Amino acid sequence: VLIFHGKPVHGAIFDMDGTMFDTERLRFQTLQQASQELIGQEFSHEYLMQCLGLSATTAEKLAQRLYYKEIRKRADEMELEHIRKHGVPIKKGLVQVLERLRKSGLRMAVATSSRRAIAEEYLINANVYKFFDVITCGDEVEQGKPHPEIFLKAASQLHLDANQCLMFEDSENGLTSAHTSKGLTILLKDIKEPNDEMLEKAHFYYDQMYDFLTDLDQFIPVMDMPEMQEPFPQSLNQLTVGIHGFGAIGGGYIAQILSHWDGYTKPKRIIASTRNSLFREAVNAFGTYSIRYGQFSYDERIENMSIVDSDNEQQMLEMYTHSSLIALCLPEQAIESESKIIAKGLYARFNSQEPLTFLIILNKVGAKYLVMKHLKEALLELTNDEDVTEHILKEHYFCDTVVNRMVSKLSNQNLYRQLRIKHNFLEQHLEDVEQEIEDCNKLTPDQLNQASIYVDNMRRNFQPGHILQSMDLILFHSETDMPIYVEKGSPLLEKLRQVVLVDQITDIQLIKNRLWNGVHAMLAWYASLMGYESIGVAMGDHLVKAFAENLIAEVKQGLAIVLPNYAKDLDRMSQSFLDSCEYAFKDPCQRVARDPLRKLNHNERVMASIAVNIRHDLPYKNLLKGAALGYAYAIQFLEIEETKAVEHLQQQIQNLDLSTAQRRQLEAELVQLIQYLFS
Amino acid sequence: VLIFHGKPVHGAIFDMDGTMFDTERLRFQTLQQASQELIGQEFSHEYLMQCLGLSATTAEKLAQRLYGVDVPYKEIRKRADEMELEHIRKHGVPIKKGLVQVLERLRKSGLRMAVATSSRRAIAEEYLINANVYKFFDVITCGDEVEQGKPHPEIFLKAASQLHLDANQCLMFEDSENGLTSAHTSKGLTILLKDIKEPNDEMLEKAHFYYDQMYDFLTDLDQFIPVMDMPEMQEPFPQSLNQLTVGIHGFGAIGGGYIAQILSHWDGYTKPKRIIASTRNSLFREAVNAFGTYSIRYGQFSYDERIENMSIVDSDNEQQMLEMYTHSSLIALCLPEQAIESESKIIAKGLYARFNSQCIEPLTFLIILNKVGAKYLVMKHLKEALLELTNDEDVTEHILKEHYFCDTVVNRMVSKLSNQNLYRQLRIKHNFLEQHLEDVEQEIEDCNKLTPDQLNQASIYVDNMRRNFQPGHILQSMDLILFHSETDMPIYVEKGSPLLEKLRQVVLVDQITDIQLIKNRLWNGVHAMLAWYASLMGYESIGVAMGDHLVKAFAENLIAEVKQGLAIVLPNYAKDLDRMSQSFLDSCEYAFKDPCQRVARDPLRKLNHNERVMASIAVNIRHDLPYKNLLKGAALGYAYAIQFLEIEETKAVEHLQQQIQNLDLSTAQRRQLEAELVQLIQYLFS
Ligand SMILES: NC(=O)C1=CN([C@@H]2O[C@H](COP(=O)(O)OP(=O)(O)OC[C@H]3O[C@@H](n4cnc5c(N)ncnc54)[C@H](O)[C@@H]3O)[C@@H](O)[C@H]2O)C=CC1
Ligand SMILES: NC(=O)C1=CN([C@@H]2O[C@H](COP(=O)(O)OP(=O)(O)OC[C@H]3O[C@@H](O)[C@H](O)[C@@H]3O)[C@@H](O)[C@H]2O)C=CC1
Ligand SMILES: [Cl-]
Ligand SMILES: [Cl-]
Ligand SMILES: [Cl-]
Ligand SMILES: [Cl-]
Ligand SMILES: [Cl-]
Ligand SMILES: [Cl-]
Ligand SMILES: [Cl-]
Ligand SMILES: [Mg+2]
Ligand SMILES: [Mg+2]
């Protein structure tokens, strides 16, 4: 029992033509063309506007009163032929509404003046027939629209009174039929500006189907955080979403968040950009990819993916124009170059005629600031107009995020290895197939012969892709951490299941940077130099875990002074980190120790902690070792020249907010400890 | 924490060749096939059996002693390695029966698992990927990454430490002598698994546990891992496939729209690799084989459940039906009552073929039929068919006593889709395929990571993959709907078969009598009584009739009076009554398709003293409960008999009084029941 604007709703009855689909426009065009090639004289726009929401038999009465079977027969044939090519024109929001009303527990039906033969055809084609218990057509009804019989019979077969049921309609005739039934009427504008009589009759009015959805969703419960192996929604909405950077995070985390969505519907397509052409062509070839959750050996298939090239402009603009939500999953190095591609997409969005929710995924203190700064400079260079830029930057929701999940991208050699192995299975599967529907079961020889031609070329196309039932494409190794923490602002994020909304994101990002990402980087450098290629395996070493526990102590002692209000939560986050590290066997040290110099910056996870501890006379001995191991890793594994390492070290220590006495002591202690490791 | 024979287990380290994969017996075949080519004569089975455990040099010296000094052993051995990889890469690594079932059980028990193989890192990883078992293992330890290989404990000690565990916390699986020593010395719980050669007495002493095969360990492990709970609606099936095949003799409504789900869930750890299903419907057979999968619709939630790993066959085709009864570990007979006699022959031909085959494991036969003692009818006809075929009373009686013939009770109402509605679907889905195949008609950049040889070869793979798969991308969000079913999950089965013990959607009972008595009075009794009312009121189906507040109120008040009675007679099934009560009222709400005629057949028989109607009244009267709705139900039966079936009013009373006298009631209660009931019938005329 749903309470819609303080009304006890038990069921819902929808009109098909003009309300659910945009078919009234089509038959408007076909009746004109059909009439021209039969009788010659086209139908007047007055006749067609009067015939809106009227049974073919009832419309034939108005045809004779003013002045049809053969005309309408060809008009219907033209109409359904348009559906065979271009599909059903489904009004935006329909699928989203239907699922919410279904899961609310409402007893739903369709009340269309169309024939059963035609009514079903479209409901089957649109894939919404499943949402309805009964359907009342313009055949079984004795007196059709605008008489309330069709709406009364619909409610009667649902075993509910009309007053308990909602009633959707586009037409003037149908709204009378709905109102005379004495149900909770809803009017959706299609191809008729509502009259005063129509506006009064209706209990609720909305400009579009999507406008009702927004009003309905404040009475529909928001679904809770998904569990690990929880299925995605079956029914797809008409919204697109983007992932700028099909990498570890984008493909191996965000794709799950977007696939779960609100738990009612799922985006039609997910457009993800990558420079990795092997990854791009591999996913487009398979159609899907899977995220491997190693802990529970669970392979999570993600579908409705379309991987595009980052350099190809027409596909990058396609994303930013048609997408409802974009996720920026790029490293700091790419932010400046790609801000040019983002600016063009946002300007292309403005040039075209909904608000955008822009998620920024980046491990950096003030991650948004960097993006917005580079985006503003990029936009101004292209637009040459400060009036349009300040509008664009204010229009869309640019959201800060905190991602705790550890994800790993598959190496190109291991992806080639996978492709080589899985190709040999396909080759053998195509030998197994090697090389007529008889019996004649309640079907004409015409249909049975026509069925054979369908089943043959279907098998011919599908049979090679039967192996995909067992065969997956594994591209990402992820841990089982679900909740992404995002800044408040965007109404869209309120309804997303996997998104948790927080306030002081800046305070969390700072602790995240220092206590999580900082300890993760420093132990990864220590582990790499000891000769571990796995975070999970490395934490098995008593020294590696002892070092991490020693670092955590020194960082938390510092943060507790800088953020005394968060001092309570440090022990929980520190323990949560070690747990995620302990069994991260498929998470490599390489990925965690990327860009060491960038991470050894004065305003970053290593040096920032050291500085705080020096100012407040706290121990920084283990932090100082990790800094030295950071430069040790940079010179030994990456080979960046020792001369540059000192020039960087000195530059960063010069930028640290310390006294010259502390600066020179820090440099002297750190350079001494670096030379100690190499000797 | 997984407890195994009083020892807490946190990890599980596996040997690869001989323990997980049957690659030792493949090496036997390659060495023989390689010898046949080069030297002309095959190496004797006896020689190859003698070589198991010996080094490559010792085996070469032994070959030199038997087949001459100039025998090209290294040439044969290298040829045999090529034949092994060539076979493994296309046909797949031969996985030991029960491994995947074991791995899922250990993994879902939260064990950190590894592989301690003497093989090279490169080749070891390919085999584990080929077999699709790499996902189960946290880390691999290889022979080329240890200073001292087996029988030194270094490889097992290393594997354990990498999982953050002491050796004594881990199960260690092995086949070879050296490996068991390596495993034993490390201090881990050693599980010895026989591969080809019977283990020596020194090994059997050394090992903590010995099994003849992986499946004997799976049987032992099952005692320590729990049977999973009743599956919820919309709950996924297991991802991992076991090597078992199962059958559905009658791919109909109940077979394809219920049993398919039960067998798809299986035990919750794994599911059958192949579900064979027999039907005479050609359109259904070729359509499922075209998509390679079909889907079951649940209208109440608008959920489409996809049943994959299906394989439909013709019921008439003998070789296909024999292959079902030869290969299947469990078969579900989902036929009508009429088809029992006719299809008794093909069952007998099937079970006889299984007896003649060398198949070794017994069969679990689930009798899916809504009839009283339905098993008796199947066993009787099967007994006659076997004799007529074999003409041997010993073989006939042996087959019947060998297999498990389980009687069942099902509560899920299912509707098979029509051939017109299927053609409609096939026409509209084929349309979308053409709409998709005009888009497919409408490129590996400088990798700087791969070599240009394997960059060229990568393009050929992806191109070949895309060309074959891309036409079938539309199957992602396209389901072939063949069945419309209710949300009733639990199936009741006779306890006996060991294979049923771990099946999670199954409810085992010592005797089926109890749940059959509930099914009779609570479901079929109310269904019959509710149908009689609907018919007299002039409704096409019960689905339409529930719109009338009289019909729905009657149904809701009738299930209540029967439930109250059964709650006293069977207090142990209290939870089952309440579950089955609402399950009936939900299904009836929109029971449009199935008419009243079938349910209202033989009202004379259904109003017997020991039957679904009169039995409920007598129970309620004995325990002083309301029976006014049951009495109305009895009246509507005699009314339906006189009006529709054209029975005499004198014949109705002649039957009635006989049934009343047989009930265990007071002579006062008998006379009162008659006087009330005859009055209700006289009104229903007018
Ligand atoms: N992976 C993790 O566990 C976590 C990562 N993050 C953040 O996620 C962000 C995304 O990085 P990941 O996906 O982890 O790394 P990654 O290096 O695997 O990302 C690869 C993706 O970025 C694109 N890309 C890389 N460099 C590019 C460039 N110069 N120009 C254009 N596209 C480029 C690639 O085409 C591909 O789509 C990072 O900034 C990181 O701080 C957040 C927290 C944890
Ligand atoms: N469905 C429902 O309702 C039910 C049923 N049940 C049972 O089962 C059984 C079976 O069902 P079905 O419906 O599935 O059947 P069909 O008819 O549909 O099917 C059969 C098959 O087999 C052969 O014969 C052919 O071919 C086909 O396919 C019957 O007899 C009954 O009694 C029980 C419970 C419930
Ligand atoms: Cl390779
Ligand atoms: Cl390692
Ligand atoms: Cl660097
Ligand atoms: Cl198995
Ligand atoms: Cl049954
Ligand atoms: Cl019966
Ligand atoms: Cl009778
Ligand atoms: Mg209309
Ligand atoms: Mg071995």
JSON list of N, CA and C in Angstrom, two decimals, chain B residues 370-372 409-411 512-529 562 566 580 605-606 608-616:
[
{"chain": "B", "resi": 370, "resn": "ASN", "atom": "N", "xyz": [1.36, -34.90, -8.84]},
{"chain": "B", "resi": 370, "resn": "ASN", "atom": "CA", "xyz": [0.39, -34.46, -7.80]},
{"chain": "B", "resi": 370, "resn": "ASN", "atom": "C", "xyz": [-0.72, -35.51, -7.68]},
{"chain": "B", "resi": 371, "resn": "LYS", "atom": "N", "xyz": [-0.35, -36.74, -7.30]},
{"chain": "B", "resi": 371, "resn": "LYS", "atom": "CA", "xyz": [-1.28, -37.89, -7.13]},
{"chain": "B", "resi": 371, "resn": "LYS", "atom": "C", "xyz": [-0.94, -38.63, -5.83]},
{"chain": "B", "resi": 372, "resn": "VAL", "atom": "N", "xyz": [-1.93, -39.29, -5.23]},
{"chain": "B", "resi": 372, "resn": "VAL", "atom": "CA", "xyz": [-1.79, -40.05, -3.96]},
{"chain": "B", "resi": 372, "resn": "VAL", "atom": "C", "xyz": [-1.04, -41.36, -4.27]},
{"chain": "B", "resi": 409, "resn": "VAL", "atom": "N", "xyz": [6.47, -33.89, -3.01]},
{"chain": "B", "resi": 409, "resn": "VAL", "atom": "CA", "xyz": [5.26, -33.02, -2.92]},
{"chain": "B", "resi": 409, "resn": "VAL", "atom": "C", "xyz": [5.67, -31.60, -3.32]},
{"chain": "B", "resi": 410, "resn": "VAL", "atom": "N", "xyz": [5.06, -31.08, -4.39]},
{"chain": "B", "resi": 410, "resn": "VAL", "atom": "CA", "xyz": [5.37, -29.74, -4.98]},
{"chain": "B", "resi": 410, "resn": "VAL", "atom": "C", "xyz": [4.17, -28.81, -4.73]},
{"chain": "B", "resi": 411, "resn": "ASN", "atom": "N", "xyz": [4.44, -27.53, -4.44]},
{"chain": "B", "resi": 411, "resn": "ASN", "atom": "CA", "xyz": [3.41, -26.51, -4.11]},
{"chain": "B", "resi": 411, "resn": "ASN", "atom": "C", "xyz": [3.46, -25.33, -5.09]},
{"chain": "B", "resi": 512, "resn": "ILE", "atom": "N", "xyz": [6.76, -39.36, 3.59]},
{"chain": "B", "resi": 512, "resn": "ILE", "atom": "CA", "xyz": [6.09, -38.30, 2.77]},
{"chain": "B", "resi": 512, "resn": "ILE", "atom": "C", "xyz": [4.61, -38.21, 3.16]},
{"chain": "B", "resi": 513, "resn": "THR", "atom": "N", "xyz": [4.11, -39.17, 3.95]},
{"chain": "B", "resi": 513, "resn": "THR", "atom": "CA", "xyz": [2.69, -39.27, 4.40]},
{"chain": "B", "resi": 513, "resn": "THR", "atom": "C", "xyz": [2.21, -37.95, 5.00]},
{"chain": "B", "resi": 514, "resn": "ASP", "atom": "N", "xyz": [3.03, -37.33, 5.86]},
{"chain": "B", "resi": 514, "resn": "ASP", "atom": "CA", "xyz": [2.67, -36.13, 6.67]},
{"chain": "B", "resi": 514, "resn": "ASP", "atom": "C", "xyz": [2.38, -34.94, 5.75]},
{"chain": "B", "resi": 515, "resn": "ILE", "atom": "N", "xyz": [3.33, -34.60, 4.87]},
{"chain": "B", "resi": 515, "resn": "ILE", "atom": "CA", "xyz": [3.24, -33.41, 3.97]},
{"chain": "B", "resi": 515, "resn": "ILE", "atom": "C", "xyz": [2.24, -33.69, 2.84]},
{"chain": "B", "resi": 516, "resn": "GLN", "atom": "N", "xyz": [2.04, -34.96, 2.48]},
{"chain": "B", "resi": 516, "resn": "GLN", "atom": "CA", "xyz": [1.00, -35.38, 1.49]},
{"chain": "B", "resi": 516, "resn": "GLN", "atom": "C", "xyz": [-0.39, -35.15, 2.08]},
{"chain": "B", "resi": 517, "resn": "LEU", "atom": "N", "xyz": [-0.57, -35.44, 3.38]},
{"chain": "B", "resi": 517, "resn": "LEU", "atom": "CA", "xyz": [-1.84, -35.23, 4.12]},
{"chain": "B", "resi": 517, "resn": "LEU", "atom": "C", "xyz": [-2.16, -33.73, 4.17]},
{"chain": "B", "resi": 518, "resn": "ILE", "atom": "N", "xyz": [-1.14, -32.89, 4.34]},
{"chain": "B", "resi": 518, "resn": "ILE", "atom": "CA", "xyz": [-1.25, -31.40, 4.35]},
{"chain": "B", "resi": 518, "resn": "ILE", "atom": "C", "xyz": [-1.62, -30.94, 2.93]},
{"chain": "B", "resi": 519, "resn": "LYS", "atom": "N", "xyz": [-0.85, -31.39, 1.93]},
{"chain": "B", "resi": 519, "resn": "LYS", "atom": "CA", "xyz": [-1.07, -31.09, 0.48]},
{"chain": "B", "resi": 519, "resn": "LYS", "atom": "C", "xyz": [-2.50, -31.46, 0.09]},
{"chain": "B", "resi": 520, "resn": "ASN", "atom": "N", "xyz": [-3.01, -32.59, 0.60]},
{"chain": "B", "resi": 520, "resn": "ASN", "atom": "CA", "xyz": [-4.36, -33.13, 0.29]},
{"chain": "B", "resi": 520, "resn": "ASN", "atom": "C", "xyz": [-5.44, -32.18, 0.83]},
{"chain": "B", "resi": 521, "resn": "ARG", "atom": "N", "xyz": [-5.41, -31.89, 2.13]},
{"chain": "B", "resi": 521, "resn": "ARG", "atom": "CA", "xyz": [-6.50, -31.19, 2.87]},
{"chain": "B", "resi": 521, "resn": "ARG", "atom": "C", "xyz": [-6.37, -29.67, 2.72]},
{"chain": "B", "resi": 522, "resn": "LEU", "atom": "N", "xyz": [-5.16, -29.12, 2.86]},
{"chain": "B", "resi": 522, "resn": "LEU", "atom": "CA", "xyz": [-4.91, -27.66, 2.93]},
{"chain": "B", "resi": 522, "resn": "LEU", "atom": "C", "xyz": [-4.90, -27.04, 1.52]},
{"chain": "B", "resi": 523, "resn": "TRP", "atom": "N", "xyz": [-4.28, -27.71, 0.55]},
{"chain": "B", "resi": 523, "resn": "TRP", "atom": "CA", "xyz": [-4.10, -27.19, -0.84]},
{"chain": "B", "resi": 523, "resn": "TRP", "atom": "C", "xyz": [-5.20, -27.74, -1.76]},
{"chain": "B", "resi": 524, "resn": "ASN", "atom": "N", "xyz": [-5.13, -29.04, -2.10]},
{"chain": "B", "resi": 524, "resn": "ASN", "atom": "CA", "xyz": [-6.00, -29.70, -3.11]},
{"chain": "B", "resi": 524, "resn": "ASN", "atom": "C", "xyz": [-7.46, -29.67, -2.65]},
{"chain": "B", "resi": 525, "resn": "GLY", "atom": "N", "xyz": [-7.69, -29.79, -1.34]},
{"chain": "B", "resi": 525, "resn": "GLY", "atom": "CA", "xyz": [-9.03, -29.75, -0.72]},
{"chain": "B", "resi": 525, "resn": "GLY", "atom": "C", "xyz": [-9.69, -28.39, -0.88]},
{"chain": "B", "resi": 526, "resn": "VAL", "atom": "N", "xyz": [-8.99, -27.33, -0.49]},
{"chain": "B", "resi": 526, "resn": "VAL", "atom": "CA", "xyz": [-9.46, -25.91, -0.60]},
{"chain": "B", "resi": 526, "resn": "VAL", "atom": "C", "xyz": [-9.58, -25.55, -2.09]},
{"chain": "B", "resi": 527, "resn": "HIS", "atom": "N", "xyz": [-8.60, -25.97, -2.90]},
{"chain": "B", "resi": 527, "resn": "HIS", "atom": "CA", "xyz": [-8.55, -25.72, -4.37]},
{"chain": "B", "resi": 527, "resn": "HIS", "atom": "C", "xyz": [-9.80, -26.31, -5.04]},
{"chain": "B", "resi": 528, "resn": "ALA", "atom": "N", "xyz": [-10.20, -27.52, -4.62]},
{"chain": "B", "resi": 528, "resn": "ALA", "atom": "CA", "xyz": [-11.41, -28.23, -5.10]},
{"chain": "B", "resi": 528, "resn": "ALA", "atom": "C", "xyz": [-12.67, -27.51, -4.62]},
{"chain": "B", "resi": 529, "resn": "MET", "atom": "N", "xyz": [-12.74, -27.19, -3.33]},
{"chain": "B", "resi": 529, "resn": "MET", "atom": "CA", "xyz": [-13.91, -26.53, -2.68]},
{"chain": "B", "resi": 529, "resn": "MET", "atom": "C", "xyz": [-14.10, -25.12, -3.26]},
{"chain": "B", "resi": 562, "resn": "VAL", "atom": "N", "xyz": [-9.02, -25.17, 8.20]},
{"chain": "B", "resi": 562, "resn": "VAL", "atom": "CA", "xyz": [-8.22, -26.38, 7.85]},
{"chain": "B", "resi": 562, "resn": "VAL", "atom": "C", "xyz": [-6.88, -26.31, 8.59]},
{"chain": "B", "resi": 566, "resn": "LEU", "atom": "N", "xyz": [-5.13, -28.99, 11.21]},
{"chain": "B", "resi": 566, "resn": "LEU", "atom": "CA", "xyz": [-3.84, -29.65, 10.87]},
{"chain": "B", "resi": 566, "resn": "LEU", "atom": "C", "xyz": [-2.77, -29.29, 11.90]},
{"chain": "B", "resi": 580, "resn": "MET", "atom": "N", "xyz": [2.63, -22.60, 3.48]},
{"chain": "B", "resi": 580, "resn": "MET", "atom": "CA", "xyz": [1.81, -23.18, 2.38]},
{"chain": "B", "resi": 580, "resn": "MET", "atom": "C", "xyz": [0.45, -22.46, 2.29]},
{"chain": "B", "resi": 605, "resn": "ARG", "atom": "N", "xyz": [-15.75, -38.52, -5.36]},
{"chain": "B", "resi": 605, "resn": "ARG", "atom": "CA", "xyz": [-14.57, -39.19, -4.75]},
{"chain": "B", "resi": 605, "resn": "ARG", "atom": "C", "xyz": [-13.94, -38.29, -3.69]},
{"chain": "B", "resi": 606, "resn": "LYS", "atom": "N", "xyz": [-13.87, -36.98, -3.95]},
{"chain": "B", "resi": 606, "resn": "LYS", "atom": "CA", "xyz": [-13.14, -35.99, -3.11]},
{"chain": "B", "resi": 606, "resn": "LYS", "atom": "C", "xyz": [-13.92, -35.68, -1.83]},
{"chain": "B", "resi": 608, "resn": "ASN", "atom": "N", "xyz": [-15.13, -38.06, 0.15]},
{"chain": "B", "resi": 608, "resn": "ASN", "atom": "CA", "xyz": [-15.05, -39.34, 0.91]},
{"chain": "B", "resi": 608, "resn": "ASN", "atom": "C", "xyz": [-14.59, -39.04, 2.34]},
{"chain": "B", "resi": 609, "resn": "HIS", "atom": "N", "xyz": [-14.89, -39.96, 3.27]},
{"chain": "B", "resi": 609, "resn": "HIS", "atom": "CA", "xyz": [-14.70, -39.80, 4.74]},
{"chain": "B", "resi": 609, "resn": "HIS", "atom": "C", "xyz": [-13.22, -39.57, 5.09]},
{"chain": "B", "resi": 610, "resn": "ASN", "atom": "N", "xyz": [-12.31, -40.20, 4.33]},
{"chain": "B", "resi": 610, "resn": "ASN", "atom": "CA", "xyz": [-10.84, -40.16, 4.58]},
{"chain": "B", "resi": 610, "resn": "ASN", "atom": "C", "xyz": [-10.16, -39.19, 3.60]},
{"chain": "B", "resi": 611, "resn": "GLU", "atom": "N", "xyz": [-10.94, -38.39, 2.85]},
{"chain": "B", "resi": 611, "resn": "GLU", "atom": "CA", "xyz": [-10.44, -37.52, 1.75]},
{"chain": "B", "resi": 611, "resn": "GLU", "atom": "C", "xyz": [-10.41, -36.06, 2.21]},
{"chain": "B", "resi": 612, "resn": "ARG", "atom": "N", "xyz": [-9.91, -35.19, 1.32]},
{"chain": "B", "resi": 612, "resn": "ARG", "atom": "CA", "xyz": [-9.49, -33.78, 1.58]},
{"chain": "B", "resi": 612, "resn": "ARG", "atom": "C", "xyz": [-10.58, -32.96, 2.28]},
{"chain": "B", "resi": 613, "resn": "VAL", "atom": "N", "xyz": [-11.86, -33.24, 2.03]},
{"chain": "B", "resi": 613, "resn": "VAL", "atom": "CA", "xyz": [-13.00, -32.41, 2.53]},
{"chain": "B", "resi": 613, "resn": "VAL", "atom": "C", "xyz": [-13.48, -32.94, 3.89]},
{"chain": "B", "resi": 614, "resn": "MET", "atom": "N", "xyz": [-14.08, -34.13, 3.92]},
{"chain": "B", "resi": 614, "resn": "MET", "atom": "CA", "xyz": [-14.81, -34.68, 5.10]},
{"chain": "B", "resi": 614, "resn": "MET", "atom": "C", "xyz": [-13.85, -34.88, 6.28]},
{"chain": "B", "resi": 615, "resn": "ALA", "atom": "N", "xyz": [-12.60, -35.29, 6.00]},
{"chain": "B", "resi": 615, "resn": "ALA", "atom": "CA", "xyz": [-11.56, -35.57, 7.02]},
{"chain": "B", "resi": 615, "resn": "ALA", "atom": "C", "xyz": [-11.29, -34.32, 7.86]},
{"chain": "B", "resi": 616, "resn": "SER", "atom": "N", "xyz": [-11.21, -33.15, 7.21]},
{"chain": "B", "resi": 616, "resn": "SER", "atom": "CA", "xyz": [-10.95, -31.83, 7.85]},
{"chain": "B", "resi": 616, "resn": "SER", "atom": "C", "xyz": [-12.08, -31.49, 8.84]}
]
